[PDB]
A and B are shown apart, each in its own frame.
Chain A
Amino acid sequence: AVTIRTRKVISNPLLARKQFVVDVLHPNRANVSKDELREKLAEVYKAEKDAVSVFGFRTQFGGGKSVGFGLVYNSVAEAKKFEPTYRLVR
């Protein structure tokens, strides 16, 4: 299966953020399949599933590896309205 690796994790207290880049290492399959990795960080990090937003998805040419960037808060009730309009449709 796929494997994620979080780098440059950093917590942010005034806006209740925490952000990290992530390297995902596909064995072969097709792509990132971003519904999987948000489930993957849901059981690796205490993620409170819908509080995460992964957007910085740049795949290197050749497949099998993608540098992902994501952001997750806590307390999902206020996390809906601290988010901009272009990703709660996700």
Chain B
Amino acid sequence: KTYSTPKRPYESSRLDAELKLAGEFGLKNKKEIYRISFQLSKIRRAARDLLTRDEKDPKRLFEGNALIRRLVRVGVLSEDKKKLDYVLALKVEDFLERRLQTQVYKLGLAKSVHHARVLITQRHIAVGKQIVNIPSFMVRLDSEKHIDFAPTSPFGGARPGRVARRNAARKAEAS
């Protein structure tokens, strides 16, 4: 299949792993947290065979530079964190930190996680040029400063919504 569950899908710690992570980050179910953990497991296993080799080895030098360079492009790993084992140290909470649904809240603009999830899926808030409607987007470090409502959105610089105008039309009929 696409995503892989762990070998046993009920533990004492696992049942509140889904409870804590979904309740604070607005996750829908176990599916996408397991998907990111699937991606992080590929990254951390790729972090292994980088690091079982030595310094001035042709494998550790080239994509070892690249692997930290890719994550500083997406903003998961910090700029000064150019260590080859800090990619082992990062956990599943920092990918969920970089999620756009949680990024909409954390920049302001939302007042809650679920109101951000509503604002994401109601085709409201744009990333620079293009307006996106996915909760999990992996907003990069460079593109994070251009998270704003779309110009064709009522919270932005457009007309008000169809029920505020209808309420304005209904009180106009009362006048």
CB-CB under 8 A from B152, the residues of chain A are: 28
CB distance from A65 to the nearest CB of B (A): 10
CB distance from B146 to the nearest CB of A (A): 15
Determine whether A13 belongs to the interface, using a CB cutoff of 8 Å to chain B: no
- Report whether over half of chain A's contact residues are helix, strand or loop; otherwise say mixed: loop
CB distance from A57 to the nearest CB of B (A): 20
Closest partner residue, chain A, to B152 (CB atom): A28
Closest partner residue, chain A, to B129 (CB atom): A62
CB-CB under 8 A from A28, the residues of chain B are: 152
| Chain A residues bordering chain B, tally (CB within 8 A) | 3
Kindly count the residue-residue contacts between A and B in the assembled complex, taking CB atoms under 8 Å apart: 5
Within the assembled complex, what's the spacing in Å between the Cα atoms of A28 and B152? 9
Q: Scoring B residues 137 to 175 as 1 if CB is less than 8 Å from chain A, else 0, what string do you get?
A: 000000000000000100000000000000000000000
Quick one: which of A11-48 are within 8 Å of B by CB?
A: 28
Closest partner residue, chain B, to A63 (CB atom): B152
CB distance from B174 to the nearest CB of A (A): 32
Determine whether B131 belongs to the interface, using a CB cutoff of 8 Å to chain A: yes
Within the assembled complex, what's the spacing in Å between the Cα atoms of A15 and B130? 42
Within the assembled complex, what's the spacing in Å between the Cα atoms of A4 and B44? 50
CB distance from A25 to the nearest CB of B (A): 13
Q: Scoring B residues 101 to 142 as 1 if CB is less than 8 Å from chain A, else 0, what string do you get?
A: 000000000000000000000000000011100000000000
Residues of A at the B interface (CB closer than 8 Å) are 28, 61-62
Nearest 5 CB-CB pairs, A to B?
A62-B130, A62-B129, A28-B152, A62-B131, A61-B130
